[PDB]
Design a protein around this nucleic acid. Structure first.
Ligand SMILES: [Mg+2]
Ligand SMILES: [Mg+2]
Ligand SMILES: [Mg+2]
Length: 177
RNA sequence: GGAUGCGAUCAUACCAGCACUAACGCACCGGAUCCCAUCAGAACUCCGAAGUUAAGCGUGCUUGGGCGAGAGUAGUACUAGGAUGGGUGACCCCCUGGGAAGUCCUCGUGUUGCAUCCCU
């Protein structure tokens, strides 16, 4: 329904000129929180990869890409480049989610946690839906089990809403797995 | 199509080597009485028209040097503005903008005004 990160196809080109009346048309698949930020990052890469700045470029089309089957579970592989405190590195990550938007959200959260990498220090190189038999990370493999079975070792005790919250109770919580 | 006189632009026009040129020219060239000129008629000056296109001038050529233009170097280096951005610091990412320079590679090697004359 609502995602932190949205996937967009951005299409643009250099402004037509007398030497090139039909300049090459470039497309990118970019992740951003909305259309405005997707366009800005599109010109960032075109400026540094194709030497086409926004001042001498033309925005053609921008469309948001939605997950095809948002009700099933897919394995998503993400190839990314990120900047640490001392240089640049490449890494491959895998995630399980119903939509690639969720998998990308997990990637940003994980990078912030395990590496203290902020959002603007990450470039997504490639994304793909990996079949179960081609996954590489064990964090994803262990859930490829037809007889998946485990208990809830840690539960969160709380009333359904704060309406039923009281400071004092006559007895302690009764918990059992 | 060119030359000559005066030029403009001051190397795409310069430098080096090699090759070539009808006609009119431009030259080299002959002489030293006079003007003039020096150690020196070499130069300068004056007078001349036997000889020669050898040189100069002109044109062409060179996987030539230089010069000129493009491409590339490169959205790199650097830089204006922004952040209770990262980092111990040194420094650096990102955001709103601007944006170079050797090497290497390709191409080019003048254009043009007025007047007179030759090709006629
Ligand atoms: Mg003499
Ligand atoms: Mg000759
Ligand atoms: Mg040369």
């Amino acid at each position: 329904v609502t995602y932190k990160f949205h996937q967009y196809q951005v299409v643009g080109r250099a402004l037509p000129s007398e030497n090139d009346e039909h300049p090459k048309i470039y497309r990118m698949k970019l992740w951003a929180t909305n259309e405005v930020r997707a366009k800005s990052k599109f010109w960032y890469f075109l400026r540094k990869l194709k030497k086409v700045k926004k001042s001498n470029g033309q925005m053609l089309a921008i469309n948001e890409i939605f997950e095809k089957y948002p009700t099933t579970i897919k394995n998503y592989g993400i190839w990314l480049r990120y900047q640490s405190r001392t240089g640049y590195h490449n890494m491959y990550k895998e995630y399980r989610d119903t939509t690639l938007n969720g998998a990308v959200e997990q990637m940003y959260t994980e990078m912030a946690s395990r590496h203290r990498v902020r959002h603007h220090c990450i470039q997504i190189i490639k994304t793909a839906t990996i079949p179960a038999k081609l996954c590489k990370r064990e964090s994803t493999k262990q859930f490829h089990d037809s007889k998946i079975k485990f208990p809830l070792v840690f539960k969160k005790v709380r009333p359904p809403s704060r309406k039923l919250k009281t400071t004092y109770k006559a007895t302690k919580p009764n918990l059992f797995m």
